[PDB]
Amino acid sequence: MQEHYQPAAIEPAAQKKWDDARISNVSEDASKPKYYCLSMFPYPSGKLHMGHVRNYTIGDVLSRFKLLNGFNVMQPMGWDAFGMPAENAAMKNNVAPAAWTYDNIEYMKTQLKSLGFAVDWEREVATCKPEYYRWEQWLFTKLFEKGIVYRKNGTVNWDPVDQTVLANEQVIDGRGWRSGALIEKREIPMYYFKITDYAEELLNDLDKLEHWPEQVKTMQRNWIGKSRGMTVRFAVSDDSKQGLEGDYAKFLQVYTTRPDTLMGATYVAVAAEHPLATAAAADKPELQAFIAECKAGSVAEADMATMEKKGVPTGRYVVNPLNGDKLEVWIANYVLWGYGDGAVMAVPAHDERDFEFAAKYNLPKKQVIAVGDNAFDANRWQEWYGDKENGVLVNSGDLDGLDFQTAFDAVAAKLQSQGAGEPKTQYRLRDWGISRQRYWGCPIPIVHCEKCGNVPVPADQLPVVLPENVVPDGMGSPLAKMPEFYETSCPCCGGAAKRETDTMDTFIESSWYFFRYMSPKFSDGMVSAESAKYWGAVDQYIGGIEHAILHLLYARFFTKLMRDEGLVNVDEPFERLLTQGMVVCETYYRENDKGGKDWINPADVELTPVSAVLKADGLPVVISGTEKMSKSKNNGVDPQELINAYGADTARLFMMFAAPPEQSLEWSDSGVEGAHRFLRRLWRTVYEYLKQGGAVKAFAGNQDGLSKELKDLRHKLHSTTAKVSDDYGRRQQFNTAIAAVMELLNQYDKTDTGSEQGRAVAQEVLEAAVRLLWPIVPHICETLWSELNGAKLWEAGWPTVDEAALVKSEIEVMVQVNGKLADLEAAALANIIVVPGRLVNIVV
Ligand SMILES: CC(C)C[C@H](N)C(=O)NS(=O)(=O)OC[C@H]1OC[C@@H](CCCn2cc(-c3cccnc3)nn2)[C@H](O)[C@@H]1O
Numbered sequence: 001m002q003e004h005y006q007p008a009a010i011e012p013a014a015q016k017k018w019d020d021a022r023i024s025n026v027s028e029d030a031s032k033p034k035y036y037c038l039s040m041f042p043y044p045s046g047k048l049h050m051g052h053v054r055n056y057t058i059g060d061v062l063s064r065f066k067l068l069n070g071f072n073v074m075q076p077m078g079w080d081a082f083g084m085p086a087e088n089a090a091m092k093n094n095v096a097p098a099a100w101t102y103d104n105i106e107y108m109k110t111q112l113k114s115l116g117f118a119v120d121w122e123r124e125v126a127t128c129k130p131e132y133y134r135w136e137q138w139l140f141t142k143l144f145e146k147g148i149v150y151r152k153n154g155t156v157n158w159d160p161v162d163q164t165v166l167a168n169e170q171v172i173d174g175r176g177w178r179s180g181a182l183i184e185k186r187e188i189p190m191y192y193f194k195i196t197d198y199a200e201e202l203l204n205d206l207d208k209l210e211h212w213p214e215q216v217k218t219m220q221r222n223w224i225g226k227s228r229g230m231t232v233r234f235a236v237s238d239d240s241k242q243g244l245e246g247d248y249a250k251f252l253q254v255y256t257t258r259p260d261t262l263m264g265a266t267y268v269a270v271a272a273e274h275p276l277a278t279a280a281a282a283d284k285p286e287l288q289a290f291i292a293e294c295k296a297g298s299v300a301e302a303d304m305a306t307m308e309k310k311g312v313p314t315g316r317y318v319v320n321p322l323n324g325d326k327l328e329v330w331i332a333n334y335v336l337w338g339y340g341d342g343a344v345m346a347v348p349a350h351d352e353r354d355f356e357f358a359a360k361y362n363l364p365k366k367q368v369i370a371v372g373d374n375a376f377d378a379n380r381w382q383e384w385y386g387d388k389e390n391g392v393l394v395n396s397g398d399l400d401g402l403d404f405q406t407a408f409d410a411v412a413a414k415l416q417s418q419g420a421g422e423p424k425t426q427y428r429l430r431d432w433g434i435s436r437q438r439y440w441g442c443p444i445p446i447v448h449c450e451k452c453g454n455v456p457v458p459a460d461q462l463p464v465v466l467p468e469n470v471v472p473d474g475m476g477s478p479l480a481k482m483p484e485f486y487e488t489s490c491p492c493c494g495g496a497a498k499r500e501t502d503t504m505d506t507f508i509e510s511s512w513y514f515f516r517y518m519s520p521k522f523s524d525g526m527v528s529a530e531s532a533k534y535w536g537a538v539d540q541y542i543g544g545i546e547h548a549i550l551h552l553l554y555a556r557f558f559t560k561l562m563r564d565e566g567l568v569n570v571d572e573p574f575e576r577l578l579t580q581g582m583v584v585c586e587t588y589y590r591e592n593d594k595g596g597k598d599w600i601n602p603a604d605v606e607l608t609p610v611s612a613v614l615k616a617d618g619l620p621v622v623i624s625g626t627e628k629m630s631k632s633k634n635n636g637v638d639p640q641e642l643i644n645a646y647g648a649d650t651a652r653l654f655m656m657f658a659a660p661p662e663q664s665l666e667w668s669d670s671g672v673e674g675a676h677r678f679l680r681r682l683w684r685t686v687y688e689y690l691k692q693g694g695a696v697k698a699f700a701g702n703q704d705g706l707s708k709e710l711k712d713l714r715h716k717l718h719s720t721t722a723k724v725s726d727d728y729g730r731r732q733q734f735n736t737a738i739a740a741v742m743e744l745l746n747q748y749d750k751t752d753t754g755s756e757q758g759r760a761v762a763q764e765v766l767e768a769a770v771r772l773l774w775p776i777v778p779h780i781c782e783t784l785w786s787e788l789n790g791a792k793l794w795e796a797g798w799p800t801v802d803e804a805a806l807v808k809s810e811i812e813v814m815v816q817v818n819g820k821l822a823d824l825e826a827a828a829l830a831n832i833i834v835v836p837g838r839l840v841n842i843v844v
């Protein structure tokens with residue numbers, strides 16, 4: 001055994017030993033209990049970053065911990081290959097997106113293997129391969145027949161200069177982020193998943209997820225946005241029926257979740273596309289310009305609530321069916337056509353948005369809810385204004401004194417009696433649009449024929465192979481410019497027809513890849529029935545918090561779709577969910593030629609501890625703030641440089657010890673050095689122990705007769721084992737488990753283990769510590785274990801707690817006062833000589 005710890009001399013040997021034993025290549029073996037630990041598979045963008053290292057180290061700690069506990073652990077990894085990154089690099093570097101993707105896959109796979117992740121590479125998948133996406137094309141065709149997938153016209157943001165469709169997040173002030181040209185709203189036929197058919201199931205099944213973070217479940221509930229409200233119809237006044245047709249001439253229908261406050265409505269609002277808005281804007285140009293502004297807007301969903309709420313009066317009026325008030329109709333920008341009836345009512349006294357809206361335009365406010373003796377102020381909003389739980393109605397006629405639920409039912413009774421309203425259930429959730437006007441994505445298996453219509457590609461002809469021999473130029477997606485691809489024959493009649501040129505939303509691949517891992521080479525279906533029955537669901541899911549809404553909802557949606565097709569048995573894909581934080585780092589810059597900043601990468605910077613310069617020379621740089629690593633401010637630390645400088649074990653240890661998984665991880669040069677220095681300490685501790693006698697049989701069994709010092713070391717040992725086990729299994733806080741082993745090594749360093757019984761306890765301490773740290777730093781622990789013990793580490797298993805080493809030994813002492821019945825004197829004083837161990841007498 002070499003004296004000094006050298007990672008490059010032990011890490012490749014440890015990986016070859018694990019590969020030889022095939023400890024990570026698992027099968028559907030009914031002997032050992034299964035465990036499915038899954039980390040979110042990455043985009044093959046080129047190289048790993050620190051977020052990748054953090055995610056897959058967390059997954060490897062939990063996987064190796066379960067493997068040591070006797071579980072048949074599957075930890076698969078694949079590549080979320082489709083998407084825009086390959087197309088942008090294709091235009092920038094004049095290469096094909098497929099070749100660019102496959103080269104990144106090979107390089108990134110080498111990095112993951114070098115990190116020593118216990119991954120079953122025989123289950124590797126690449127979502128851009130036809131052997132993978134043929135099965136989502138298959139599920140598409142099956143749901144298209146059932147109507148779960150359907151085709152209708154939608155509105156997109158078209159960029160006329162870059163010649164492609166843009167999301168709202170890519171539109172800035174009505175212009176494209178790259179071209180800067182005004183975008184054009186265009187209606188085109190697109191495909192949709194009818195996810196709203198599963199809204200109630202996707203919402204209620206969240207209650208089954210007892211091992212999910214409360215906020216992830218809360219965020220999905222708000223996204224689905226189920227509400228139990230009331231449809232209300234306000235009759236249009238006879239003086240406001242100009243330009244109206246049909247039921248819009250008779251009434252204005254709205255939806256409200258607060259029908260208990262219907263007596264407090266002071267005005268109503270409609271969307272820009274509403275027929276009432278159209279009829280009132282016929283002779284008013286200010287209303288026309290306001291309708292145009294609402295249509296031209298491209299506010300993202302994450303920003304719809306933070307935009308300035310603006311409205312315009314119409315001069316049209318409607319009548320409240322309860323109290324008979326005549327309310328003016330307003331056109332507002334926060335009312336969305338397609339949500340409900342495209343029109344709402346407004347109660348400024350009990351809705352904060354209506355309060356700010358009414359305060360802006362001096363619209364009336366009518367208090368109809370009271371909570372205790374709290375005073376009501378029409379000029380200042382208070383939080384109790386919106387209380388649904390502890391409020392009673394006021395100024396509501398015969399509804400006064402009623403609580404929320406009974407007033408709700410009373411309003412429903414009155415409205416249904418007049419035929420002016422009825423209870424109604426609504427959801428904020430929209431249907432899932434999956435059509436993408438891009439090349440590098442899964443082709444939609446639809447053929448357009450003028451005789452047969454939109455026809456799904458038959459099951460025998462799947463996949464519809466995306467041609468890889470394409471280099472996109474940036475003048476429209478190539479699939480629309482490639483007749484050799486879209487020109488085909490109709491599979492129903494054999495006549496001239498054209499393939500669909502749009503590709504699938506890349507979230508589709510990430511919505512079912514966890515099932516494909518169970519049988520990645522299965523060519524008769526999405527997942528073999530035998531594999532899905534054995535692996536069931538994912539036991540542990542690890543990934544970034546930014547996927548808590550869309551991705552997880554899509555995966556839960558796809559799991560229930562595949563379940564109803566008879567492919568899988570479970571209702572939920574992920575039992576336990578671990579959401580990790582981001583990795584942040586310092587930023588550096590030199591000031592610009594024209595009053596600006598130019599950001600420098602930290603790896604090209606050297607500090608003094610004060611100022612900092614760049615290593616190539618000595619010209620100083622300005623140290624700026626800390627934030628998430630990104631190419632925006634050039635502060636991403638390449639993990640390959642960290643692996644080259646210190647080795648894989650140091651990287652893994654720093655990621656786990658710097659911050660808990662949920663907390664943000666701050667990059668620290670001083671922190672990485674401490675991690676590497678602790679590995680040097682662990683190596684020297686084992687070396688110096690073996691250099692003083694060699695390995696012995698670890699202490700086990702009756703600890704009677706052991707010294708107090710060695711009994712105290714065993715107590716710390718098995719309490720550390722119990723602490724680490726509860727950290728890996730229950731708390732999933734790994735930096736405290738590292739600190740717990742550090743405390744065990746500290747007490748070991750302070751304990752004389754030179755005697756024969758001492759070296760047996762020292763052997764027991766070291767054999768436990770290297771197994772307690774093996775999930776985090778497996779290379780050095782595997783190397784040290786083989787020096788301490790000849791048995792296979794994974795066959796020795798997770799260290800067991802010795803409960804006997806946790807009991808404390810005191811002596812039963814009797815007391816007597818005047819004949820009749822230091823440390824022992826203070827106890828018997830809290831009940832003057834003392835005979836050692838047996839009696840104590842209190843000479844009273
Ligand atoms: C399931 C599927 C939808 C996953 C998808 N393919 C994906 O997100 N693929 S991905 O390749 O983007 O990420 C793969 C996984 O590991 C990293 C996690 C990032 C966490 C946030 N973050 C980023 C950084 C950072 C960035 C740049 C430089 N240096 C550090 N630091 N923290 C992801 O959320 C995911 O769990």
Ligand SMILES: [Mg+2]
Nearest residue numbers: 207208209210
């Ligand atoms: Mg349960």
Ligand SMILES: [Zn+2]
Nearest residue numbers: 449452490493
């Ligand atoms: Zn046809």
